Amino acid sequence: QGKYLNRTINILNAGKNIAKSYGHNKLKPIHILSALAKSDYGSTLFKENNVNAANLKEYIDIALEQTRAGAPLDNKSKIVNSAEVKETLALAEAAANKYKSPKVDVEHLLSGLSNDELVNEIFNEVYLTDEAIKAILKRKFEKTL
């Protein structure tokens, strides 16, 4: 039970581990994107939209390194959501409710992540536009019907 699907929560928790690896004690949208791109569901999603997996991971890793906050933190140190991520989740929740989904899934998280300027630069470079995202969301709803 819960408003977030398991797979969504798993992406968020993998994101925290990526954040610590880049020396961050605050989870950031780029960290969540790294996690989403590598997850089972996220990787399949990008494939179908025809987003080259190698090229996307390469953009993500460049951005992860540019924004590195330190050497890896002990994987028993404390990590909290940044204000940026609290927004990611608020927008994911809003998008899910708009498309009449009772749970927040990976596509909704994807829509939320597109608010972040760093993540959105990346999306625009792999030709995943705002219009494309909406279409992903619209198709997902329609498979419900």
From TrEMBL:
<comment type="similarity">
    <text>Belongs to the ClpA/ClpB family.</text>
</comment>
<feature type="domain" description="Clp R">
    <location>
        <begin position="1"/>
        <end position="144"/>
    </location>
</feature>
<protein>
    <submittedName>
        <fullName>Heat shock protein 101</fullName>
    </submittedName>
</protein>
